[PDB]
Amino acid sequence: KTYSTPKRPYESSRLDAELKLAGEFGLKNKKEIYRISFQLSKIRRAARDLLTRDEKDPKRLFEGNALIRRLVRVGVLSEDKKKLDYVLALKVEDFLERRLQTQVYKLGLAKSVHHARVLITQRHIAVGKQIVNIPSFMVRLDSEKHIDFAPTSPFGGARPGRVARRNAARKAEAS
Amino acid sequence: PDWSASIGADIVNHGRGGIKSLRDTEKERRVTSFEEDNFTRLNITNKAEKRKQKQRERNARMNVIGGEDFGIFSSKRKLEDSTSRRGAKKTRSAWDRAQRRL
Amino acid sequence: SPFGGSSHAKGIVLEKLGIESKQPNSAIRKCVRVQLIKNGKKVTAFVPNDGCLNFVDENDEVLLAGFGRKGKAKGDIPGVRFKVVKVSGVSLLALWKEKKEKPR
Amino acid sequence: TPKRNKDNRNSRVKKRKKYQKAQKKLKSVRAVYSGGQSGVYEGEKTGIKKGLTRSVKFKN
Amino acid sequence: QLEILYGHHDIVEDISALAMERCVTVGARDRTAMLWKIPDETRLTFRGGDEPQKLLRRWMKEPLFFCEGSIDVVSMVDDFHFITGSDNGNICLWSLAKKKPIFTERIAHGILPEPSFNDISGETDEELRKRQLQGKKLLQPFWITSLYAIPYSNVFISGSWSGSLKVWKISDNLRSFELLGELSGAKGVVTKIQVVESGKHGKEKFRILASIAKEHRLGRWIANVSGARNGIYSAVIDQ
Amino acid sequence: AVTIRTRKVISNPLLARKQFVVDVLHPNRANVSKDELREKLAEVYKAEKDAVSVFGFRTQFGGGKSVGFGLVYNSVAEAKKFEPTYRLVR
RNA sequence: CUACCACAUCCAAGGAAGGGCAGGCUUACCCAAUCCUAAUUCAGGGAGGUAGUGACAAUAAAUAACGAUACAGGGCCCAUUCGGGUCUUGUAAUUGGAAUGAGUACAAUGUAAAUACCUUAACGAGGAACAAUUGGAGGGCAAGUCUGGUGCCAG
C-alpha cells in the first residue's frame, strides 16, 4: 500500500499519540500523521547510511550536504543546523509544525486550528501568486512570509460574501 | 544564479500534485521550447498518459516533498562509475598524474 | 479446517431443536441440526438471537462457520461449534437488521 | 440503526472534543501551568493542605 | 493591471528598470537583490556574505567592518552589472554571472558624528562621560539612502545625509570604481538623484537633480541634522 | 480591460505568413474571450481583421493569464484558400 | 479457373449453385494531428483519436467554523476497599452576524466535430438543512411471561 501502519496498531502510548497530535494540530485522522511518519522514516533511514561512512567519503560528502540543504529549503531544519545527525534528531512534530493549516493559525489570522482548517478548505487564503486549498502543504521557509488571503476573497480585498450581501439585500427590502 | 521560479507559480493542482520538482521543470521548458519553436501542440492520449502522468504523479507524491526530492537517497544506484578520481583515463604510468598537477 | 479444507459449510436444515423449550433465546432453544452436503453427517448449529431462529425454517441451505467462544456462558451447551451465518445465500445478521429478504 | 450522534459523523469535530475532554482530565490528574498573572491576585484559590507532600522520594 | 510578482521576505525598498523587459527589486531586512524576468516570472537571487571575522582578518594580515542589515537603493549601470546601496555604507557592484559581489566597497559617506558627551551623560563627571562614549564601539556609519546611476555610463552618484553627493567612475573592465570627488552644494538628507544630459555626441552639458529633505522618506528617524534645507539640488556639469 | 503582449514575432515571406505567441493578461473576468483579442490586434497591428487565426490558447491554472498563439497573413482574398478547412468556419 | 475427393445449402426434384469467427464452462462517434494512396490545399485509407464495457486495486478535501448572553453547581483522575486527590465545568439553554460548496444552472474558452473542459453568471445553511455508517461494552423499564426455591427470593 501507500502508507504503512506500525506493526501493532494499539498501544497505551499510541492511542494518545493520535489524541495529542490531532487535537493540537487539527489533524483529521491517523492517515496523514502516519503518512508523514512514513516519509520521516524514509528520511531517517536515508540518514543512516549517510552516517555509517566516514569523513572525506564520496557518499557522505555530496548528498550529505544536499540532505541538509533540502530541509533548510523547506524550513524544517534551521539554518545553523548543518549537522548530519540533527536530521536524525528531528521528529514528527516539526513536520506538523510546518503544515499550512497550522501555519495559518501560527501567523495569526485564524484564532484557532479548526477555523484555520475551515479557512483553508473554503478557498480563502493564498500562497503568493496562487490560492491553495490543501491543509497539508509543506510551506517552505522562503514562501512562508507570503501567506495572506486571496484578492478574490471576502476577507481580502474583494466583495463581501453571498450571505452578507443577501442580508444587505433583505434589509434593503425592509427599507 | 539559477533562474528559480516564483512563489505561487510552481504548484500544479492546488494540493495533491507536488509543489515543483526540478526534473518537472526540465521537461516543462523543453516541451514549451518545442511549443515556441515548432509552433504546434501535443495531445493527452491514454497510451502515454497511463505512464507519463500516473506513475509520474505517484512518484511525485512520495519523492518530491515541499518542492524538494527525498526518495533519491533511499535509491540504491551506486555512484562511483560516473566519478572515480574525477574522470577516466587515469592510471597506467606516473606521467598521467605528473602532467595533471603540473 | 473442521472437516475438509474449507472454513464454511453449505448444509440442509432438517429440523429445529429447542422450539419446545420454554425460556426464550436460551442455548437449548437456539440450537438447530443441519446435515453437511459433502458427507451427509448431521451436526448441530447455534442460531443467535432468537429472531433469526424465527427466520430459518426447512431446506434453506444455510452457511456454517465456527463458534469461537471465549469462555463458558451461563447455560451454554459445550461441544456445539457451529453458528449459522448465511441463510439462502444472504447474511443472517442482515436479516436481523432486515436489510434483505429470504428468497424462496 | 441505533440512534447515534452528529459527533461521530465527522472525525475532525470528534478529535477536537476528545482532545479537549482529555485536556480537562489532564488538569484533574496533575496541576499543569496556565499563564501566570496579567492581573493582581497573589496566591491560590483551592485551599492549602498541610500533610500533602506532592514530591517524589529519592530512594537509594 | 498586467502582472504581479512575489517573493521578497521584507518590504521592497527600491525598484529599477531599463529598456529590456526585466527589473531588479531589493528587500531590506532579508538583504536580497532580486532580478526578475517579468514576462517569464523567473527570479534571480543575490545574497551577500561579507563575513566580518574574515574581513577583519585579511586587513590585519595586510577599518570597522559594520555588518549590513538592509540594502536600500538599487540601479543597474548596464545589463550585466548593477549597484546596490546598503545601510552600512556598502556600495556593491554585482555581476549578473556572480552570486557574490564582483566589487565590494566599504563605508562611503564615513561614520556618523559621535554623540555628545554631556547629552549621553546623565552625570556630572566629564571623564565618566568619556567612558560613556565607549570609543569606536558606539560609532555608527552613514547609510546609503540614495544611489543613482546614469544608464550605460561609467559614473554613478551616491548620497546620504552627510550633505555629500559622491561620484564614482567604474573601470573599462567593469570590475572596480574609484571616487571621483564630492558635490557638496547642498546639505541635508538627499532622497532621490536624477540626471539630465543634453547636447551633441561628445559635447554633453549635464543637469543633475537631487531632492534634499529634512528626514528620511519612510519616516522621521532623524537627529542632530544641521542645515536641513528642503528643495532641489541642481548641479550643472560640462563636457 | 485586457492587455496583449506579442513575443517572438517573426515574418514569413514565401507563404505570406507572420506568427507570434501572445501573452494575454486578464484582470479577473472569466476567460480569454477570443473575439476581443482578435479585435485587439486589429487596432494594434495592421491586421485586416479576418486574416488572423489564433489557436494556441493554453491558460495557466489560476486564471488571469493565458499564453496565446496566433498567425496572420496579408491580402485576405488569397488568405481564405491558404487556410486549412478547420478555421474558416470561425 | 479446371477436373478429383469430402461436406453443407435451394427446388416444381429436371439443376443452379457453395465456401468459420467472436463468447462461456463492444463491431458506436471521427479525416483535424500523423503518415501512405485514386488524380491526391479538393479527397481516400480498420494509419490515429473520444464514448459506454470495465473500482481484478489504490487515492485528496468537505460531511461546519466564529461569538454574545442566561442558567446551574459539580465534573474529572487514582486505587481491592474505608477512601484519597484536583479544578470554571456542564448546558437537548436561548441567540447573533459570518464564510463556503454539494448542487442547480446563461454564456464564454477548449478540442477538427466533439467529449471531458478552464469557467463565468444569478442563486443555493439554520439545522427533522443539502438529513453517512460499521463494530464493541454496560445497563435500566411493565398490573408482561416462564423455571426453580426454606414467605417478600434466585434465574
Tab-separated table of all heavy atoms in Angstrom, chain G residues 78-89:
chain	number	residue	atom	x	y	z
G	78	C	P	-8.103	6.657	36.155
G	78	C	OP1	-7.428	5.833	35.123
G	78	C	OP2	-9.559	6.497	36.384
G	78	C	O5'	-7.349	6.422	37.538
G	78	C	C5'	-5.932	6.490	37.622
G	78	C	C4'	-5.456	6.387	39.050
G	78	C	O4'	-6.012	7.474	39.832
G	78	C	C3'	-5.877	5.134	39.801
G	78	C	O3'	-5.018	4.039	39.533
G	78	C	C2'	-5.838	5.577	41.259
G	78	C	O2'	-4.515	5.512	41.769
G	78	C	C1'	-6.240	7.049	41.158
G	78	C	N1	-7.657	7.317	41.511
G	78	C	C2	-8.074	7.370	42.849
G	78	C	O2	-7.257	7.158	43.758
G	78	C	N3	-9.369	7.651	43.119
G	78	C	C4	-10.227	7.880	42.128
G	78	C	N4	-11.496	8.152	42.424
G	78	C	C5	-9.833	7.839	40.768
G	78	C	C6	-8.552	7.570	40.515
G	79	A	P	-5.602	2.662	38.950
G	79	A	OP1	-4.543	2.042	38.113
G	79	A	OP2	-6.939	2.936	38.368
G	79	A	O5'	-5.801	1.748	40.238
G	79	A	C5'	-4.715	1.462	41.107
G	79	A	C4'	-5.166	1.428	42.544
G	79	A	O4'	-5.728	2.719	42.896
G	79	A	C3'	-6.281	0.445	42.860
G	79	A	O3'	-5.830	-0.884	43.055
G	79	A	C2'	-6.933	1.063	44.088
G	79	A	O2'	-6.153	0.816	45.247
G	79	A	C1'	-6.839	2.549	43.751
G	79	A	N9	-8.048	3.022	43.048
G	79	A	C8	-8.291	3.084	41.696
G	79	A	N7	-9.476	3.545	41.385
G	79	A	C5	-10.055	3.797	42.616
G	79	A	C6	-11.310	4.299	42.988
G	79	A	N6	-12.251	4.655	42.113
G	79	A	N1	-11.570	4.430	44.306
G	79	A	C2	-10.634	4.074	45.196
G	79	A	N3	-9.417	3.594	44.967
G	79	A	C4	-9.192	3.476	43.648
G	80	U	P	-6.433	-2.079	42.162
G	80	U	OP1	-5.337	-3.036	41.870
G	80	U	OP2	-7.185	-1.464	41.040
G	80	U	O5'	-7.489	-2.799	43.117
G	80	U	C5'	-8.749	-2.202	43.390
G	80	U	C4'	-9.597	-3.060	44.293
G	80	U	O4'	-8.753	-3.874	45.139
G	80	U	C3'	-10.494	-2.303	45.260
G	80	U	O3'	-11.717	-1.920	44.655
G	80	U	C2'	-10.684	-3.286	46.410
G	80	U	O2'	-11.754	-4.179	46.134
G	80	U	C1'	-9.374	-4.083	46.386
G	80	U	N1	-8.405	-3.763	47.468
G	80	U	C2	-8.678	-4.022	48.811
G	80	U	O2	-9.728	-4.462	49.250
G	80	U	N3	-7.654	-3.716	49.675
G	80	U	C4	-6.407	-3.219	49.367
G	80	U	O4	-5.600	-3.001	50.272
G	80	U	C5	-6.190	-3.006	47.972
G	80	U	C6	-7.165	-3.291	47.102
G	81	U	P	-12.275	-0.422	44.795
G	81	U	OP1	-13.503	-0.321	43.965
G	81	U	OP2	-11.147	0.512	44.547
G	81	U	O5'	-12.696	-0.304	46.327
G	81	U	C5'	-13.732	-1.112	46.870
G	81	U	C4'	-13.693	-1.096	48.377
G	81	U	O4'	-12.481	-1.748	48.826
G	81	U	C3'	-13.647	0.285	49.016
G	81	U	O3'	-14.944	0.837	49.177
G	81	U	C2'	-12.914	0.043	50.332
G	81	U	O2'	-13.815	-0.410	51.331
G	81	U	C1'	-11.974	-1.106	49.974
G	81	U	N1	-10.570	-0.707	49.703
G	81	U	C2	-9.681	-0.761	50.757
G	81	U	O2	-10.018	-1.070	51.885
G	81	U	N3	-8.385	-0.427	50.445
G	81	U	C4	-7.891	-0.063	49.210
G	81	U	O4	-6.696	0.211	49.088
G	81	U	C5	-8.868	-0.047	48.166
G	81	U	C6	-10.134	-0.367	48.443
G	82	C	P	-15.152	2.310	49.783
G	82	C	OP1	-16.461	2.821	49.310
G	82	C	OP2	-13.924	3.105	49.528
G	82	C	O5'	-15.285	2.072	51.351
G	82	C	C5'	-15.557	3.156	52.223
G	82	C	C4'	-14.758	3.058	53.495
G	82	C	O4'	-13.656	2.135	53.317
G	82	C	C3'	-14.092	4.343	53.953
G	82	C	O3'	-14.981	5.209	54.640
G	82	C	C2'	-12.941	3.840	54.818
G	82	C	O2'	-13.393	3.528	56.126
G	82	C	C1'	-12.560	2.535	54.111
G	82	C	N1	-11.356	2.660	53.255
G	82	C	C2	-10.090	2.527	53.838
G	82	C	O2	-10.003	2.320	55.056
G	82	C	N3	-8.986	2.629	53.062
G	82	C	C4	-9.103	2.850	51.753
G	82	C	N4	-7.988	2.946	51.026
G	82	C	C5	-10.375	2.980	51.129
G	82	C	C6	-11.457	2.885	51.911
G	83	G	P	-15.650	6.462	53.884
G	83	G	OP1	-15.717	7.596	54.837
G	83	G	OP2	-16.894	5.998	53.224
G	83	G	O5'	-14.596	6.840	52.753
G	83	G	C5'	-13.653	7.883	52.950
G	83	G	C4'	-12.249	7.406	52.692
G	83	G	O4'	-12.272	6.345	51.702
G	83	G	C3'	-11.299	8.437	52.109
G	83	G	O3'	-10.736	9.291	53.088
G	83	G	C2'	-10.279	7.576	51.384
G	83	G	O2'	-9.368	6.999	52.307
G	83	G	C1'	-11.168	6.469	50.835
G	83	G	N9	-11.689	6.792	49.497
G	83	G	C8	-13.007	7.044	49.223
G	83	G	N7	-13.229	7.302	47.972
G	83	G	C5	-11.981	7.218	47.385
G	83	G	C6	-11.624	7.404	46.034
G	83	G	O6	-12.375	7.688	45.096
G	83	G	N1	-10.265	7.232	45.837
G	83	G	C2	-9.360	6.912	46.817
G	83	G	N2	-8.083	6.787	46.426
G	83	G	N3	-9.687	6.734	48.091
G	83	G	C4	-11.010	6.895	48.304
G	84	G	P	-10.543	10.854	52.772
G	84	G	OP1	-10.021	11.505	53.998
G	84	G	OP2	-11.790	11.363	52.145
G	84	G	O5'	-9.387	10.883	51.677
G	84	G	C5'	-8.077	10.446	52.001
G	84	G	C4'	-7.227	10.264	50.769
G	84	G	O4'	-7.863	9.347	49.842
G	84	G	C3'	-6.987	11.506	49.938
G	84	G	O3'	-5.999	12.350	50.490
G	84	G	C2'	-6.610	10.923	48.585
G	84	G	O2'	-5.266	10.467	48.596
G	84	G	C1'	-7.529	9.706	48.517
G	84	G	N9	-8.768	9.987	47.770
G	84	G	C8	-10.039	10.083	48.276
G	84	G	N7	-10.937	10.336	47.365
G	84	G	C5	-10.213	10.421	46.187
G	84	G	C6	-10.644	10.671	44.862
G	84	G	O6	-11.790	10.890	44.460
G	84	G	N1	-9.584	10.669	43.966
G	84	G	C2	-8.277	10.444	44.301
G	84	G	N2	-7.375	10.473	43.313
G	84	G	N3	-7.866	10.201	45.530
G	84	G	C4	-8.877	10.204	46.418
G	85	G	P	-6.198	13.939	50.443
G	85	G	OP1	-4.873	14.573	50.641
G	85	G	OP2	-7.333	14.308	51.320
G	85	G	O5'	-6.648	14.211	48.946
G	85	G	C5'	-6.012	15.214	48.178
G	85	G	C4'	-5.553	14.687	46.846
G	85	G	O4'	-6.370	13.559	46.451
G	85	G	C3'	-5.679	15.669	45.698
G	85	G	O3'	-4.578	16.548	45.627
G	85	G	C2'	-5.818	14.764	44.486
G	85	G	O2'	-4.550	14.268	44.088
G	85	G	C1'	-6.620	13.603	45.065
G	85	G	N9	-8.080	13.735	44.883
G	85	G	C8	-8.963	13.598	45.923
G	85	G	N7	-10.207	13.720	45.574
G	85	G	C5	-10.153	13.935	44.212
G	85	G	C6	-11.218	14.134	43.307
G	85	G	O6	-12.431	14.159	43.544
G	85	G	N1	-10.756	14.320	42.017
G	85	G	C2	-9.438	14.311	41.650
G	85	G	N2	-9.184	14.508	40.355
G	85	G	N3	-8.432	14.123	42.487
G	85	G	C4	-8.852	13.939	43.755
G	86	U	P	-4.800	18.114	45.862
G	86	U	OP1	-3.472	18.758	45.962
G	86	U	OP2	-5.798	18.277	46.944
G	86	U	O5'	-5.440	18.604	44.495
G	86	U	C5'	-4.741	18.417	43.276
G	86	U	C4'	-5.649	18.610	42.095
G	86	U	O4'	-6.639	17.553	42.063
G	86	U	C3'	-6.468	19.885	42.102
G	86	U	O3'	-5.733	21.004	41.646
G	86	U	C2'	-7.643	19.529	41.206
G	86	U	O2'	-7.283	19.645	39.838
G	86	U	C1'	-7.847	18.048	41.531
G	86	U	N1	-8.934	17.814	42.511
G	86	U	C2	-10.242	17.853	42.065
G	86	U	O2	-10.557	18.076	40.909
G	86	U	N3	-11.191	17.620	43.025
G	86	U	C4	-10.979	17.353	44.355
G	86	U	O4	-11.945	17.165	45.091
G	86	U	C5	-9.607	17.323	44.738
G	86	U	C6	-8.659	17.544	43.826
G	87	C	P	-6.094	22.474	42.175
G	87	C	OP1	-4.865	23.301	42.148
G	87	C	OP2	-6.844	22.319	43.441
G	87	C	O5'	-7.104	23.043	41.084
G	87	C	C5'	-6.769	23.047	39.704
G	87	C	C4'	-8.007	23.053	38.846
G	87	C	O4'	-8.798	21.878	39.144
G	87	C	C3'	-8.955	24.221	39.066
G	87	C	O3'	-8.559	25.355	38.312
G	87	C	C2'	-10.315	23.651	38.669
G	87	C	O2'	-10.502	23.741	37.267
G	87	C	C1'	-10.172	22.173	39.045
G	87	C	N1	-10.828	21.799	40.322
G	87	C	C2	-12.090	21.198	40.288
G	87	C	O2	-12.661	21.020	39.205
G	87	C	N3	-12.681	20.828	41.445
G	87	C	C4	-12.058	21.024	42.602
G	87	C	N4	-12.668	20.651	43.726
G	87	C	C5	-10.772	21.617	42.671
G	87	C	C6	-10.206	21.979	41.523
G	88	U	P	-9.422	26.712	38.311
G	88	U	OP1	-8.486	27.821	37.997
G	88	U	OP2	-10.239	26.800	39.547
G	88	U	O5'	-10.382	26.542	37.054
G	88	U	C5'	-11.647	27.189	37.009
G	88	U	C4'	-12.699	26.309	36.385
G	88	U	O4'	-13.995	26.672	36.930
G	88	U	C3'	-12.829	26.424	34.870
G	88	U	O3'	-13.251	25.169	34.337
G	88	U	C2'	-13.951	27.443	34.716
G	88	U	O2'	-14.634	27.389	33.482
G	88	U	C1'	-14.858	27.073	35.886
G	88	U	N1	-15.669	28.192	36.378
G	88	U	C2	-17.023	27.994	36.529
G	88	U	O2	-17.570	26.935	36.282
G	88	U	N3	-17.711	29.086	36.989
G	88	U	C4	-17.198	30.325	37.305
G	88	U	O4	-17.954	31.208	37.708
G	88	U	C5	-15.788	30.448	37.117
G	88	U	C6	-15.089	29.401	36.670
G	89	U	P	-12.817	24.721	32.856
G	89	U	OP1	-11.597	23.887	32.982
G	89	U	OP2	-12.797	25.916	31.977
G	89	U	O5'	-14.010	23.779	32.377
G	89	U	C5'	-13.952	22.375	32.582
G	89	U	C4'	-15.223	21.840	33.193
G	89	U	O4'	-15.732	22.779	34.174
G	89	U	C3'	-16.397	21.634	32.251
G	89	U	O3'	-16.303	20.443	31.491
G	89	U	C2'	-17.585	21.650	33.202
G	89	U	O2'	-17.715	20.399	33.859
G	89	U	C1'	-17.141	22.691	34.231
G	89	U	N1	-17.736	24.024	33.978
G	89	U	C2	-19.009	24.242	34.468
G	89	U	O2	-19.640	23.403	35.089
G	89	U	N3	-19.538	25.482	34.225
G	89	U	C4	-18.924	26.507	33.538
G	89	U	O4	-19.511	27.576	33.392
G	89	U	C5	-17.612	26.211	33.062
G	89	U	C6	-17.075	25.012	33.291
